[PDB]
Design a protein around this ligand. Structure first.
Ligand SMILES: CCN1c2ccc(F)cc2N=C(N[C@H]2CCN(C(=O)NC(C)(C)C)C2)c2cc(Cl)ccc21
Length: 280
């Protein structure tokens, strides 16, 4: 029953006032789905991320329980949740070293550094997909980095869902653009686009308006590289497996974690000078 659901939700969310438990709020994102802030956990002295969502309920209960019971080092993990009147606040981890967008727009990554990042992102995807969660918004903006090179996937555009056109145009799979065929493989396509961001600094068609880019992806399908000859055969093979037109042929996160390209990954510490240079 209706009221028995609101009482179950009230029993699952954390006790306390998040306006008192968190301080130094700084708005980092906003859209029609909600607001994202960074904040300081008063008790722990750790920087956190907080998503605030209004009325837009039994699904909420299972979704909260799933993220509270399932943790992974390559995602910003659920820390707490609160009901503030009609709003639901979700507190999760945060990394303040910067985003992969900062790194790719400011610095040049080598194949060893791209392989390390791809591996960490693939581990996050494998975890989410095993919990029937499809991200739908994989892109460099959603990869937070720690100063030590640690990698955490976030969902600050509110796209992830347990299995309306969702995502960011340049990173969308063709089957999402043409028929909204969401599935784990759209995250693999998006990772392939993010791997292109790491080589060229941008996804394909970034110079075009986002709506035209949809028409370019729907017609071109598998995007072409500017200078493929500058890449190893193993990296090129990894990209082809991520950007396969055939959904079935496209590699899963589990399969791609076995790819020979990831075997050349440099330690995550190799990203620290890029993070530092991208920050300033
Ligand atoms: C905040 C942790 N979080 C997560 C981190 C980083 C990400 F990139 C995605 C992501 N999304 C998850 N679940 C989805 C599904 C439902 N949901 C969601 O906020 N539900 C409400 C609004 C709270 C009810 C997003 C997720 C899934 C698992 Cl198994 C573990 C942690 C998760």
């Amino acid at each position: 029953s209706d009221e028995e659901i609101l009482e179950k939700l009230r029993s699952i969310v954390s006790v306390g006032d998040p306006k008192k438990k968190y301080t130094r709020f700084e708005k980092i994102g906003q859209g029609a789905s909600g607001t994202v802030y960074t904040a300081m956990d008063v008790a722990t002295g750790q920087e956190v991320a907080i998503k605030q969502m209004n009325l837009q309920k039994e699904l909420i209960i299972n979704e909260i329980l799933v993220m509270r019971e399932n943790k992974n080092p390559n995602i910003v993990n659920y820390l707490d949740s609160y009901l503030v009147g009609d709003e639901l606040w979700v507190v999760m981890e945060y990394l303040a070293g910067g985003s992969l967008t900062d790194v790719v727009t400011e610095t040049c990554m080598d194949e060893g550094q791209i392989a390390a990042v791809c591996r960490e992102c693939l581990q996050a995807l494998e975890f989410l997909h095993s919990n029937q969660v499809i991200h739908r918004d994989i892109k460099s903006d959603n990869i937070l980095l720690g100063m030590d090179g640690s990698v955490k996937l976030t969902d600050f555009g509110f796209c992830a869902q347990i299995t309306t056109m969702v995502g960011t145009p340049y990173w969308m799979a063709p089957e999402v653009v043409t028929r909204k065929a969401y599935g784990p493989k759209v995250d693999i396509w998006s990772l392939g686009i993010m791997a292109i961001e790491m080589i060229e600094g941008e996804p394909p068609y970034l110079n075009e308006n986002p709506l035209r880019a949809l028409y370019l992806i729907a017609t071109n399908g598998t995007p072409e590289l500017q200078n493929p000859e500058k890449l190893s055969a193993i990296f090129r093979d990894f990209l082809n497996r991520c950007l396969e037109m055939d959904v079935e042929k496209r590699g899963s996160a589990k399969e791609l974690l076995q790819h020979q390209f990831l075997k050349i990954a440099k330690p995550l510490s190799s990203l620290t000078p890029l993070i530092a240079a991208a920050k300033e």
